Symmetry: C4
């Protein structure tokens, strides 16, 4: 896999199965999968930061990002490509050096520009054919972890080294 | 596909898997799928309004409808066919120009009268027989999106046009 | 099908997938499926009462039973066979005239004594082999509805008559 | 099977599908499966204590451990192997007399040292290959029950004895 300086990810439909839980009082939930915490683990193990880009804006996601020590969080993003370009500029890198995973229409422009594009198996067909690697997992099933492990070429030897 | 002037939809079992979450305090939840927001996107892209018909009446659904900018919301509806007919009268269209998706007994009368009837794959067989197009997805899996994309003939060219 | 005068049902693992949601504050949730409301519909259409027997005791279930107009509710039940006997004795009913659906160890004694025993496809093997009819559905997927429809012989003629 | 004196288990990804539900207010949920309560039942029927080891630390899990009468609860565990070793010392047993089920990186060292290692079908490949018995079930689907029933050789005769 090519040199990656930054891993970027959408939330809904990647870190979740797209589920948005509403109650009667104005509260909202998302269901994350702890498996995806290993995606952050491996990225940080390899010295690579992770950022979240989302068009939603919730305290749900601020708290999850905090729990997992995610390096960057941008919410209420209207243009994910622009947001990614701004973060690349912030860090002194280019989009070819970015791996991005997303699942829907508002991810497409960014997916087409990054060094490595990932799309979960659960995403719409139009979006899946933008993926530059095959991801078997669906949103919420640990597909962010799957993406990171493929992008970084994590193998049995890496595993053996971290469980010493 | 027939000329459609209005898309109507049930909620529970279409926008959800039928799940109704109850706690100990009288609160209630539903789990929506963000994928279904694209059904509204495509309808509005084609200049078609969307209405929700539901026999339930919840702040859950009021809030979800307003998040997605749904054009019409009728809750506490005991007679979905008559609600659809009244909206058709208001809009100056007929039921043959309506696409409706529903999943259960109280949807049947309306399903039999519309121009295009959709039923999720998870619905009872005697309701599925009423569908006039095949839907692969189950309730809560993005079947409202699936329905809209089929009804409106959304294709790769439409996709390419919206992503710049 | 043999004469059934009462339908009895467990909750967890039948009306749900066994899920028990806990938060940080002492609240609890269950996820019901609206499909199962049709089981009450068909029972009542045929003049048959429904009772719930559960070893748990929650406001969750009290509220669900009330909305669905369930005829009898017994919570905190230590011995489901005894509870069924005592209800049936009040009503004049023999266990051979009862259909009961349950999923786990504390259901077995009653399942072995009723006229029609149902067990969801998701239940443990030792319990499934007690079922006297095959149920395809899993807990929380509408298996109470499936059971009722099979028990009462609900057919296309019934459907046609209710949706005219 | 091997003689087992202690059953140990992780929570997230074993007793759950890995789901971690976050709301807007700082609360958190897990979804347990009631089927897993039979794992405690069978362990206690055979006179074997059960302990939980988890790196998380929540009121959610305090409550579940209480409901199920779990013998030992260790949360915020930094090193699961060390925690198991210390508990074994207290009990005067060795790791070869322990059955442990876990699903992820921080379970690997302990899985490699116990007498019977179990890993759910949903776990990462690198962890599944450490399992010494095959488990069909995924996290949250009753895999703790499956593990206990296999480890203790529960059979139809055992079932018949408990439902008298
Ligand atoms: Cl978004
Ligand atoms: Cl859920
Ligand atoms: Cl309804
Ligand atoms: Cl019970
Ligand atoms: Cl852990
Ligand atoms: Mg998304
Ligand atoms: Mg419905
Ligand atoms: Mg049960
Ligand atoms: Mg775990």
């Amino acid at each position: 896999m090519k040199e990656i300086k930054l891993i970027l990810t959408d939330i809904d439909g990647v870190w979740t199965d797209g589920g948005m839980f509403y109650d009667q009082t104005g509260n909202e939930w998302k269901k994350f999968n702890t498996s995806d915490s290993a995606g952050i683990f491996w990225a940080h193990n390899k010295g690579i930061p992770v950022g979240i880009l989302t068009g939603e804006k919730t305290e749900i996601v601020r708290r999850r990002a905090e729990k997992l020590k995610v390096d960057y969080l941008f919410q209420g993003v209207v243009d994910k490509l622009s947001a990614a370009e701004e973060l690349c500029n912030e860090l002194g890198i280019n989009l070819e050096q970015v791996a991005y995973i997303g699942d829907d229409l508002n991810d497409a422009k960014l997916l087409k520009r990054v060094g490595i594009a990932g799309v979960p198996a659960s995403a719409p067909f139009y979006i899946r054919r933008l993926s530059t690697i095959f991801l078997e997992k669906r949103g919420g099933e640990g597909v962010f972890r799957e993406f990171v492990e493929k992008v970084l070429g994590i193998n049995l030897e890496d595993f053996i080294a971290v469980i010493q």
